[model samples]
Target: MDAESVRRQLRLGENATAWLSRLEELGPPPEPVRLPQGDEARDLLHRLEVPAPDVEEIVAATPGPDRDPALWWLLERAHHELVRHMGDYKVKVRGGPTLPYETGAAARYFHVYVFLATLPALRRFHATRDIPEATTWETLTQLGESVAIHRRKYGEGGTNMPWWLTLLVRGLVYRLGRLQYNLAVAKDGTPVLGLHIPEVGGPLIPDIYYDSLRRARPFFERHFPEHGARAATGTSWLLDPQLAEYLAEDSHILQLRRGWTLLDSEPQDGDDAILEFVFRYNGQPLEELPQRSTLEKAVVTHLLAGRHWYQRSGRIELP
Candidate 1:
């Protein structure tokens, strides 16, 4: 289905209408394109297997609107985003060295898994009820099963990275980029962009993308209340309540301050150390340096450092 079709399916009430209207201002998504499904589709399905949900059976068994159209719409949008970006129905790592920067189905599944893991806390907060700890594992397991179904339905194609990595990165994009943007609050009790990650290990990695991700949290929280609640109350809150709290902490804000410090740390003259640092953090090899221009090199350097500042800090801080 197309974006408009999916939006129409949502059937947003008056409250949701305002939010949907704003999404339009973000500019239209790039033209949709049909992605190719390669051989090995069966093998991919077998690897990340999932049992079918008895949705129809349950809907038939249960009373009215249990299978809400809006809920289904959310599911469709989630599924669509995953499939559209991954390109393959199944998961596979897109971009990076092994895949030549193409989409993968397995990667999509991975992204879903990461999202599921983080959903519990948000879900509870939205539901306004504390979920029992005992059921947390089962909830996560169920989410995994659902993700597996998506992977199976899509099938896999040959790619080096597994489905999980895609979930990891994509989930980060959603959690930090989309979800947090909605629910975040400032220290002064003001509502602001809330998507922020304080530390990976024990150290901070302050990058612009991280800041952007942090800032987007409150906005997303307001826009997608159900999703925001699901994430807040789902596994993220249950498994690591500290994570949600960390996002709201003073230390977390300070960590972001450190990010600004690095942003302004660029050297005036293009130094070899700076160039080498850029390529290394960016997952680029030193051998590729001769092929890059000074402008490209500088931009890459800035981005690479910002993108990987967290990982860099982790190496030094963690055993």
Candidate 2:
């Protein structure tokens, strides 16, 4: 699709277009949460949070090596929840001037990117090779640019913005960077990689970051056949069987360690509640983690607050 078509698909309506024009008129977001001068943000992310699965619990849950179907179900659910939430946030924020929603969506995007970048351990456990650093860096740059653009648009008007905005943005960006770094080292492929998928079972590579790469695939595909096909296929390489077994086991471990009792809870319906919750809580400042900050809060707050009328009506205040 063309740029306009992509924007339309993303639900960027007239208001968002207007806002984008305003932003171009104004300039980029204020001093972004810069990764130290010469270093990629990943370099400094060593000091951030890592999703550490409780190894013992994982091992205990998977006593036998036949492959636990429940584990796969949980993994799929977790991925579904994540993707659903992220997509909801994106669609909710796309049509309007809801800064808070936009910010939260952006924050979610940031987190998703981080998750993709940090699958190294997962990769090794599965015995897969590392995804190239250049790939990770490119994704980071895209996220950073988006964040910068939004920040400048919303940072203006006041010195004391609401606490929620500050917290959400800061927390999202910092945590996102950290997560990206962890993934960069955690594994080499997407979370979907290495699964014993029905048709394409094996130590397969996963590409959870499919949306991020969607825009650029065609250009590269035209020039490089193999890379292009791989991009289009959206699969990872699963080299060794032993490694695949280990990776599958590790995935189980990750599930048990990070497993949420809430997974058993029924899914919520109605887009309104989901969007509202995200705006209210997803991007809020973590009282406990003061050191970690993100621009997500600020962006989200602005987007939502920008259209108070629609918010009160139990609908996103779209433009």
Candidate 3:
């Protein structure tokens, strides 16, 4: 199955839902075109594997035929956009001539990189009430280097540009710096990126991001060995459970202490409903908390219902 051909078929009106079903039936789709980010990664488990503090009781949270069509369309755009683009920002300048904060969600969080900050620009690119795919691949390279070359020697008033632009660049400078103050330090105290991913590029810069990802891929394999191997990220959402295996020690832990019990093998991965779990953390009761991932949602719901030692004579176990 050529990936592009299949993608084309889906675009030709094969229902997105049905195409997704068929894609899953065919098993993992070809790892779509690579991004500059190598072997990418998975990270939600720590946040949802054990469940996050929720704030809802919506029998209607997940997208459905009943939701607002406009919002659903917007979210769909966001999801598709993220699924297609990969990478995060590090520099202060804009890369390409494109709009910022165009989308959001399971799409890379930093895809925005405080993206709205990049908004209100001169969007003269087109007139469609939305930017075109022609507007893709906005990068730090977009800002250009005159600022760097001039400012390196000129100090505060180096660029001699408008005060507003200077202030804007200065603000970006501060944001990037604070991002430094808040860098991730691994177990051995070595600073690491909190979420480093493939830097996908389009036209102007291509090979660097891709080849760089390939080169550093060796270290990536060794670093996050538990990371996605066969079922990596950027794949269809239905086919992406690569993170299911590697999670926090206490994620969805089940303990039972009772006379009779019935549990299934592994975990059931399915969308059951838009739900909330009312489980007590430590000891205090929690409210109708909203959850995104169905796996943890199901786990917390089930575990919240059962808690006791389940042994031949009724015993409990701990991790």
Clashes of each: 49, 42, 19
lDDT against the true structure, each candidate: 0.31, 0.26, 0.25
What tens digits encode model 3's per-residue C-alpha lDDT throughout 1-319?
3333433432323333443333334442132221111111112111111111110101112233233332233233322332222221122232211111132221212222222222222222111123232322221222222223223323311121222222222222111101111122344544333312211222212333234324332332443333322211111111223323433334321211111122323343322211111121222232344455554464455446662111111111111
Model 1 scores worst on lDDT over the 10 consecutive residues at 310-319
Estimate the TM-score for candidate 1.
0.22
For model 2, give the RMSD to the true fold.
25.3
Candidate 1, residue 262: Cα displacement in angstroms equals 30
| Candidate 1: residue 100 lDDT (0-100) | 16
The candidate maximizing lDDT is 1
> What is the descending lDDT order?
1, 2, 3
Q: Compose the digit string of candidate 1's lDDT tens values, residues 168-227.
A: 323322333212222323334433322223111233434544554444434345534333
Error of 2 at 50 (Å): 18
Q: Point out where model 2 deviates above 4 Å.
A: 1-131, 156-319
Cα misplacement distance, residue 124 of candidate 2 (Å): 8.0
Global lDDT of model 3: 0.25
lDDT of 2 by residue, 1-319 (tens): 3324423444455644553443334332221111122223233232221111211211223211134222222222222222222311112111112322232233223232223322332223222223244433332232233333233334421111222122222211111111121111012342110111111112212232222234233423342223222211111111111222323443532232221111222323322322332232234443422222222243234335542111111111101
